[PDB]
Amino acid sequence: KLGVHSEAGKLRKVMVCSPGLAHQRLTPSNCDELLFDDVIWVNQAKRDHFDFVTKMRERGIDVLEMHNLLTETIQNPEALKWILDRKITADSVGLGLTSELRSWLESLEPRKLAEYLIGGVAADDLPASEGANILKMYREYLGHSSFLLPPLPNTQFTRDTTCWIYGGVTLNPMYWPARRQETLLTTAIYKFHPEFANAEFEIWYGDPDKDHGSSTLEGGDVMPIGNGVVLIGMGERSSRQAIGQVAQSLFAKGAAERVIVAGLPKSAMHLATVFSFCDRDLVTVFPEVVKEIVPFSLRPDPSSPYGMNIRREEKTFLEVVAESLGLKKLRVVETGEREQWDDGNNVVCLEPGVVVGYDRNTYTNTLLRKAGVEVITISASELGRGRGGGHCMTCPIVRDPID
Amino acid sequence: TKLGVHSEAGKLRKVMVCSPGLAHQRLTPSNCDELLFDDVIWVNQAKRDHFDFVTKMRERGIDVLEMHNLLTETIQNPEALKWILDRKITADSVGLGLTSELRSWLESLEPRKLAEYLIGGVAADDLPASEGANILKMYREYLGHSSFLLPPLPNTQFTRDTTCWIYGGVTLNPMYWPARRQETLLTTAIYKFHPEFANAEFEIWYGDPDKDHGSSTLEGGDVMPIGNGVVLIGMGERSSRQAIGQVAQSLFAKGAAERVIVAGLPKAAMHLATVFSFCDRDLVTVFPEVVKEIVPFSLRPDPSSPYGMNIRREEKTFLEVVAESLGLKKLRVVETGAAEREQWDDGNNVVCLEPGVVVGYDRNTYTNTLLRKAGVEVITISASELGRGRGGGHCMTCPIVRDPID
Amino acid sequence: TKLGVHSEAGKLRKVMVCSPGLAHQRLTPSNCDELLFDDVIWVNQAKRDHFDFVTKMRERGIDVLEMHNLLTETIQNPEALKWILDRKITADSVGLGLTSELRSWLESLEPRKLAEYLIGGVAADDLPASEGANILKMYREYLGHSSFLLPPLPNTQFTRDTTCWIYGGVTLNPMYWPARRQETLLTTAIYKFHPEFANAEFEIWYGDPDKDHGSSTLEGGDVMPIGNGVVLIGMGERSSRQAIGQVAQSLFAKGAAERVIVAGLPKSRMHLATVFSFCDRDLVTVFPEVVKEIVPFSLRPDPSSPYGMNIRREEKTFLEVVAESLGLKKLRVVETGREQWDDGNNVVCLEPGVVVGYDRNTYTNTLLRKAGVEVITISASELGRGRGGGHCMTCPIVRDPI
Amino acid sequence: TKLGVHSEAGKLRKVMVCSPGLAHQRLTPSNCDELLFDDVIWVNQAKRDHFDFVTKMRERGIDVLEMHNLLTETIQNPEALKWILDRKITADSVGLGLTSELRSWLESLEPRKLAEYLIGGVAADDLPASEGANILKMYREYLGHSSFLLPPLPNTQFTRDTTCWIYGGVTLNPMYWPARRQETLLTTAIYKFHPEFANAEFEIWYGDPDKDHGSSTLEGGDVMPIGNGVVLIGMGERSSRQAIGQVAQSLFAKGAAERVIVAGLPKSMHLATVFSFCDRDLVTVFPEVVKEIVPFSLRPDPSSPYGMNIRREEKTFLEVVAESLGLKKLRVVETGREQWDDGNNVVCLEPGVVVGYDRNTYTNTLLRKAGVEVITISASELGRGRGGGHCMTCPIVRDPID
């Protein structure tokens, strides 16, 4: 039954990932190294998160927290073998502490382990030793990273690393060095855990065991907007080598009938980061980016060197999108009169016309509520400096079509 | 032939080089930072300058192998070309619009010209008019993307850190920057296929263009066979511990070396051969603000431990540790970039041809004078273009045959 | 009790402060680049945060005076307003085509508003339809220009930097950056006209909004009258030896101070009080990484010297020298950046052993309590994305000898 | 005895260049950022390329003046020296501790060198031994602080910038970066005392080292006197409307020129940097930015307060410029087959004859295609200065064309 068949449809089952350890390790010094804008105050980011999480449960939406998913999953000796088998090598940990680290973890509670598998494993967290203690000399005298296992403070944006796309999902070959260790854990979930091992569903593209090279795909850039149409933001973090490959997979399994490729200006971002549906016929938009997007339609045609053909659409993205859906016009609330500045994109839809956005985009939020949209609010004090919104912070596994 | 690197100062007999070309012709003040080069150069002059520096060495009895010649030569054996094309041209690298079109093209080129493109990349530009290539042309022009089917490798120039020769073997280096991994494939290719290397006897201590490697990153500039069964491996920005840890036990496992000295580099910018370079049996240059901040580690073999290695931390200054290691009372040292320095200059990264015989940059006139004072012959070449590459005689060389001392 | 700050830990009687305003509402990601601000903030939220802060000080006695507030009142004095306007409104600053228009509209202004804009600044869309403003409205939209006629001063928020008080007297600081120079004009015209300041006794040690100072900068964060005739100034950063030399010299000449300790800081690119702050008579927090690098120097008078003083190097740690400087045996130091990273420097002393900090710094704030210190907290979430803490967000005017 | 620049293309007659000097020697990788230079160049070799340049003009009958010679000639007149020093050396720049020593030192020096140091700076080291200087070396090493009593001015090599000639008047410009206002002083003085100047005729439309010019910042490179009372002036990030407007309102009111076309630059260059003349109707541009600039015609008007009107244009800048030179349209070569180069910033020794960089083979060829003789200087060093011949020159006397 699993499958996201639109963006605005009714949401039922979403993954998400509260902040936590991974972030506790952050540090002005390590911020960028670690790929996270600003050191947040973890305790309250967790409160605020679960908070957002609740306003979603209180609507009868099944919220899965990666953290549980991971904790359950590794209660299966085989899966756990599976993660560790890949997550502790002479190449990532170092040959001098592969057995040390492994056994330590293997020797912790189901919960304290999932924590570390996400938030990471400092040398400190290990019992005295020769080796653990050369890594402490390293971080100490010269200030090297003391990470056996590196934190993934970006797990908390679950949107990015996998995509439910109709009756199936992609395991995403991430852009930046750090996040690539994300896609693995989530694979192990989809792969072992009892709500999926049983699930009927295909894996469109991806595999944490291959090396994907220049091919990267990030959830943000993927939009299954129904009618068998997939939006893909291409250019910045998701690439032609990657896209065109999903394109053909989707096509070669009657998942989707046409992808529409959103070419994103470089001269960092994600589609949904500048384009966000709220209602059947309405989208939040970051002007200055969108008005410079260049559309291209991939389509199944047996007379292509690949089974695909590609047009340059003749209309603006908004026009092309407008049609693809069976519409003529797209209601547009552009952000990016005005009290102050906010960016109100990257909102998530719980249902046709129901949106969760930030407690701070006050101007945008009354326009949204002026276009007849109900806005659930959550707090952007900390989750906000992570540059992520509601849409970034969720991963739809189950969402209805809009006929 | 018996290939090996048994020192930093020894008589140099065989060097690999690569001159600037199509790679650097492709540089622009806006594509040059993602391309991992520092500044646009006068390619046509850099060449004249590089052929100068290549010739100055050859004129001294030394074999100098041009990468481009070597590849161009390798590119002839269809087993080889195939062996490269199969791993360079694939969907993840090129995409499904282009592979055939691309390789089909590639293979239709004359050999020499194929290695040009192999080092310097290939834009849509260069491919024949095609549905496919135009999309890319129209992605570039319209959306500001890159036309790069195969991406230029302006850094090949820097054959030093793309592979090291540690005594009777070479390491296939897993590069730091996702930009330069593409490089290793080519050298390896040469080492495996080129008449000169295929028949030669030598080990492969560490590496494989066919395995990922993750956090293990080893760059050659960081590696120093200083003779006396010791290896100095700088551990800083480019060379991680996972790689060093391994290249270590592979060296020990075959009595290639006795002692590895991890040069602990503070926070992570440049190679070790960049603040610290050799000159004579007993002379070294030193970026003092950095050298003086290293923390030396002695990493020896041990049957007494699981991983047959033991690692102790050393209280003497790095210079001292190195002294001890060469059986030496202590090193004569000339510092580079406050006294009667007429103007600022960085003298390091000079290459030895042989003890007391060295190549550095013309412009570094204050340092190169000391070098002379301390009794070294200093041969110069033009910094004007080569040096704006942020790299000197050392970085630009990858020794293959160099005699030990004494 | 005359106006004067005579310690750092001592009893806090009168401080000045400035809450997030119009200047912050103007921040958009594309310009807080160049207005010396790290992020764009919820402004409504920040005001709350700042008020809370305020109350928490006031509800304990402190005479808290708010810039906007004092400036509003100041303006009501026609002579004062002209003073300000003759200077903020030039042809070098606003421009030939817009000096009349923009001044004339400003005086049409109701005071609470007029001042709202002095700190917050004027863009060309607060202006009456006009030809001259339109080429601006024009410049900014087509050629992506700074449309601002008067620059927004988000930083006035940090009242400690624009002026210090040093025992009986005040320095009006020649800010470093250009994003901030403007700031002092306003504070100067307050001390100068405002009723409250205009009449009582105090000295001007250093500085003049009128004068072009050159490579002389001095930022308040860098000048701590620790009391006991001693004055530490942190030099090398925002605060240059060209000012410091002179502050010191006037301080000796008017005998505000017996000794100036230059806490020469290692160049980088961070005031002194963002790395080393007082919690108690014998207590400081301390960003150990930066502190352990400071090289102290001692300035003293010298009746017989040319320049009225004679500086010499201090052999013990900076910290040891401060210590022996207030005649303590040893300063208890607490460091700051075990369960997540923490920076809790920059707490302000409301009295000996009572400070204001941020709620996010629980580790450090924990130690501080253990140090015999009671810690009032306020919310960082927005106030602390600023760049500042209790110590930045306050300019003490009246604080007791310790 | 009269001077001026009545075009860009006319027979050049008098140019002021400045050869890379002691200041370039002072450049270190970790300092050349705050000095505002883009690379530590090889001085001796910049020095020889620059001369080569100097000579190559000197041979086509041009009279070149070096800023080092002229500064020299100047400061031998004691009053011009007193005149500079009293401004160059103050307690706000050299610091009370040193003015005395520092000034009494230079005065002891011979011309050739004393000038040398002005353009070059002077660090503690250079000072004769003294308690004063060492406490500066003290800071330098121990603390990383500058120890420059006087600032190095390695940008002096770019004379186009500091002073403009426009039709028998000249602007002594208020430079953008603090790190460069120090030149204006020096050139100003030469023009004010040196017999080659103090005696000729010409006005001073805009400029005074003395005044503080708020946001009014103007640079030569943004200013082109093209011919019949048309002055191009790019208003961007370097040249500010605050001046631009004064500079016009001075030009008109004095008969000097009949229109300014403000060349509106996108955010973040000099005009002469993306747009340059090689002949009566021949220019090189840089399409990324030339294509996207919004001109403005600025002309005099009796029927208005500030006595000017600005109409925006809809025609492209290139077009605007053509219609004001009275030409059908503009012949255009675009730069910025083999490899990338920006062939721009070429300077005209006469109409159709120009000096560019030798590296730029490609553009040189199009230019040669277009009927320009292209005399070339090396780029290996002077090129890392980011500027070309246009940059490296100060048209003092140049013939009109219409």
UniProtKB/Swiss-Prot annotation, chain D:
Active site annotation, chain numbering: C391
Subunit structure and binding partners: Homotetramer (Possible).
Q: What is the regulatory mechanism acting on its activity? A: Activated by Mg(2+) or Mn(2+) and strongly inhibited by Zn(2+).
| Domain of life, source organism | Bacteria
Question: Which cell locations does it reside in?
Answer: Cytoplasm
GO MF, one annotated term: arginine deiminase activity
Native species: Pseudomonas aeruginosa (strain ATCC 15692 / DSM 22644 / CIP 104116 / JCM 14847 / LMG 12228 / 1C / PRS 101 / PAO1)
Residues folding into a coiled coil are none
Q: Which family does it belong to?
A: Belongs to the arginine deiminase family.
Keywords, alphabetical: Arginine metabolism, Cytoplasm, Hydrolase
A Gene Ontology CC term for this entry?
cytoplasm
Q: What is this protein called?
A: Arginine deiminase
As its record notes, the protein acts as a catalyst of: L-arginine + H2O = L-citrulline + NH4(+)
The EC number(s) given in the record are 3.5.3.6
Q: In which pathway does it act?
A: Amino-acid degradation; L-arginine degradation via ADI pathway; carbamoyl phosphate from L-arginine: step 1/2
Biological process (GO) annotations? arginine catabolic process to ornithine; arginine deiminase pathway
